[PDB]
Amino acid sequence: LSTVSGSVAKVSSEKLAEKPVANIMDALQGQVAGMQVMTTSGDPTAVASVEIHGTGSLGASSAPLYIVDGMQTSLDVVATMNPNDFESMSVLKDASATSIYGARAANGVVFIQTKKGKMSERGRITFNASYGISQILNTKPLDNMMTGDELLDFQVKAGFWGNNQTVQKVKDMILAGAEDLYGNYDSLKDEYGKTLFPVDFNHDADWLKALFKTAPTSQGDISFSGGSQGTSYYASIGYFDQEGMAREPANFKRYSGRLNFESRINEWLKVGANLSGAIANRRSADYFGKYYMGSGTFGVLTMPRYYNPFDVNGDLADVYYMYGATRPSMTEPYFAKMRPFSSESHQANVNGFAQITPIKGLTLKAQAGVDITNTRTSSKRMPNNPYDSTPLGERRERAYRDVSKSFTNTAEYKFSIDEKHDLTALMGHEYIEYEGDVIGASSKGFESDKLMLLSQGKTGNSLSLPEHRVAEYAYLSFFSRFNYGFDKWMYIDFSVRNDQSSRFGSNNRSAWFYSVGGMFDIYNKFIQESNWLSDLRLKMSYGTTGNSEIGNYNHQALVTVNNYTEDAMGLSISTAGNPDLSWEKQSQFNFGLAAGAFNNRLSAEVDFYVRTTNDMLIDVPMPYISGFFSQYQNVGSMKNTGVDLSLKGTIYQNKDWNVYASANFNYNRQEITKLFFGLNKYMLPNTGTIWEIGYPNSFYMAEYAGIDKKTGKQLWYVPGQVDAKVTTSQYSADLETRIDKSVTPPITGGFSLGASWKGLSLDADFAYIVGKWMINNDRYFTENGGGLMQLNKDKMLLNAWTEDNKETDVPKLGQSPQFDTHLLENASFLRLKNLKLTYVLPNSLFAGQNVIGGARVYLMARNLLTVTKYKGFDPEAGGNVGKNQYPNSKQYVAGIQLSF
Amino acid sequence: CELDRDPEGKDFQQPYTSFVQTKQNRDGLYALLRNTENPRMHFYQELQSDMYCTTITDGNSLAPFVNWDLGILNDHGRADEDEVSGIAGYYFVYNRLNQQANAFVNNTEAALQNQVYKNSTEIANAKSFLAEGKVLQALAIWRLMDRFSFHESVTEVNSGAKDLGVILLKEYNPGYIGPRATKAQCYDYILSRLSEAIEVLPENRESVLYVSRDYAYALRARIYLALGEYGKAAADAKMVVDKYPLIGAADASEFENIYRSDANNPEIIFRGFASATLGSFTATTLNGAAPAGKDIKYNPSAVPFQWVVDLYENEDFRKSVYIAKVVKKDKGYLVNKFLEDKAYRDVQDKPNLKVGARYFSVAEVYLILVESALQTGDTPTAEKYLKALSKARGAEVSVVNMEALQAERTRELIGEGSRLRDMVRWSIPNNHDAFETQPGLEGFANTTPLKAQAPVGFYAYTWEFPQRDRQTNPQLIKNWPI
């Protein structure tokens, strides 16, 4: 699966088990050197963005190939599996170790190995269960936002409500408007003043509590693993449910089963299967990361505190009011029951294999499997709702289908040519097929919750066109790989392969890739024995790899339907086209050294690498004159130079008292080499980043220079102008400049500590990402005094430069902010990924009853500690910008385990 | 192992083999136009004129244009596959129309020249679909010039841009990335496209859902007018102005039923096909409307200054349809021209505020003929058509004297993106900081000052080029100075 020449990290079972989020790649943040994982949303349902050894490309995905028991599976399907069934994860991060994988092995491959049975006398049954609660992990953003009447004054003095108005005039007017508005709804007309106080200038409404809650997570599983003669079995059922801490509803629950089975049938055959599936319900808060009045973490900062979404019992009303509103505005819980949503995914994954061993040395292995996912989702717009636009309701039913085949069969001939030459030769064929499909139907006009079958809709101007989307691709691959071993010290590995993708035209879909590698046991040749050095090995590899992770149909020159009337169809030009589109061709040289000290109780591995991406798949943007948006082309090139090192040892093994630490670090310089059309730079509009040849993907802005204490105006630095640095109050786009801040953070790392005091144990896992930067789009609103004067603002605007208030750094009221360096925040962070205190019950408590044999209990926290300078909720919850984030959660969990 | 995968619901591009393939491509052309020459796209430049103040409800969406927030207007808009809006959008949809009309015109010339049509009537019609595509290209380029080339009156500019038009591309070429044509380059392409079409298109309009000779005569008269060629504008006007009659209304209810009807307004020369299920869109930016049961409530983000409300006589049928005293409850006016066509309601009873894309109504033709006739000293025909247009609207004008033309036009064209151009040509600066706000809305529609003044000849009455087109094309000279 992996080779002796590759950069390979292996993560153990314990780094994987019982983690209160269904996003298992989060559990690896800071565990593997050079692997930079990052989850940008606390939404239960989100999946991380892993990148091994830098960003691989400026248009293709940089996602590693994910592999489970041999076949590619999506992170989304990995999420439907029970990770307590994973024995180990292996990260393959260089050309030699990723040499027998395709599609996008240019991004590294993540190989997950599920447990196969241990061949014991009695089988081991084992039961795990844990309960816990998710919270929000940072509250600091609202420490310094104006209070209710703090902003009332601000607004009035700025002229927002009128020229000649007093605060009370405005206070009278807003609650005037709330009583007459509420006074038109039977369900409100005489609850305002009794049970509903939508506007209240004497209490500050807790808008944090309005839009976020504590939420629970629950997990359990049984696992029977055992064995005998040649057969090995591992079976498990389990359950998981993580509820979303944002009050905007989102959840991921799965009901899972797995059976892994392997058997020697006879000295000539070994067959085996590993079978898994799940019934899964996921739902997602689809408003986060956009700006909607009073929703998300933006809502919790932006809603004026004189607006009460609560009733008189402190519970969340059905509705709040905002001045001017035509309609009362539904709160988040009442919106949900009014806009229901469910979806069930049935996930089936069948996997067999056969291992004929016909002669000494030869292994014919045929392996194949399916990956069926049918998802069926429902959506309602509940009728007769008095705070909706109409009393008429609608319904939307969709059904989804993904079927993924993969066959991958091999012949492996290993022999020995004399006593000092060991050769192992292996080649194979692999066909991957994917066919997906989505169907959707919708009706409207319902006037009864009990009469809402799709067949019962209004028929006429009320009818809908169905939803229908299809997608298929395929990969044909022939590959080979040889392993030559001289003496028991020198190893060479060679590999050549050909990959063919449906995603390129017929004349451009094949591509050849090679790799060479060597490992040299410097210890076991040149140091027969040393009293302090235990292990010293040198690795080295060169190779080429393909990246095809793009979008299925990006080469054809296509026409689609665009009807103008109802009696004849019409045709519009759909795509530009690139008849030559083909594979992206990456190349990586890796220089490694792995060493073990004392008695391999102190080990390290350093690696230097040069990752070069040529023929790079860029979705080159097009001038709008073209009448298009983009078109993929093999255009440009990029370099990722860097190092990653990792070390681990034990600090005090005391026979009954072991102390263990481990650490890992990567730095990676990124350098674009080639762009498109000979261009030297391309700034990507409305993003504040830029592609420039000399440098990496960097941010691009005007340097904000404070304010003129004499005028109160904003000033920016003019690039290139000096005195004997020049400021100006006249902002222009031609004032912007490349900034020595890169988007993908160059440093990725983590460390982890551990002690075990005879049964009582504590493990801490840390992870950091330094050099990270982000634009805090949220502060564009909370901090400006030039617009959006409805919204709550930071109390720093009570300092705004006026004739009477100079010696402040907040600009005069009346000017909108520009997207300059005043929003480039340093999103670097150390985070405590998990703290786990576990206490394994004594061994002698189970000495009289031959039924239960051991037990363990544990307290645990995910994401408690977050050291960072970022002035926003979660510093992870963004790439280049952070808008209205769903912050990652902080979890408290108690759990128990039983073994029989 | 065939690893060919091809997408469902797509076919490969080819040259035109059949007449039925050609007719289908012409329909796909008019489909695009309907989401391009669309009122939603012209609201931005309507909101930039001297007529609007923002309300407390706006969320910095209309503020950039109304209060001249130049720092936001510079790179304003979107045109990606999630949202197509704003300046960036306006620019992008017209170039697609121009690009896509280019590929229709060229592939019809190709088919005609290879005699792929099977009889003289197929042949004769494609020569006529060809003229239509020529008008579409003329519209596409002129709309791009309307906003992205300077009027002659602008003072300080980026060096080179004062005489430049937009990037002229006459062939379907996705990979093309060249420089800006000159002003006279662009305008000679526009007028010749149009002239070649008036030669081929039949005298009398064939369908209000397609380009007609009546339409091109009108669109050319519009284009001549903004070029100051008053004699030429009046000549194309008279060729269409009498073929479409004014609404026969006795009160404002008789007016509103007719005017708001895409189907029954006898003044509509050229509109895009719309149904309740295809081609109808909501245009609730100007009015802030939303349905409430059987009713409509309004929460605008912008409303006219009092001087706009005071423009209208009280008996003007327009003062309850183009603008409507429906702010707060009965306290102030909003621009309500794009309110609804009832024929597009999913349910008779329940309004959805959907409209269709209209492209030219004879009202404008009356105002083009009236302004130009006044300019060319033709007082009789300037007075004839102005008294007619205003009297049919219930508010006939006392005197005919350009001052009256400027008012009447401003009233009649409200909401259609016309005032900003008119203030440039009539040499009116933006007095937004000094206009009185409507009294009835005290506390809701308050004064907000400009973030940058807009005097006669200010460069930002003309938009900057989208930042996409600049960053990918070093051969582009930008409009705005340093």
Partner: peptide, 13 residues
């Protein structure tokens, strides 16, 4: 409602 004050689009998703 919704406030497009301005979204810098997430040009690194």
């Amino acid at each position: 409602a919704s406030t497009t004050g301005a979204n810098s689009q997430r040009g690194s998703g």
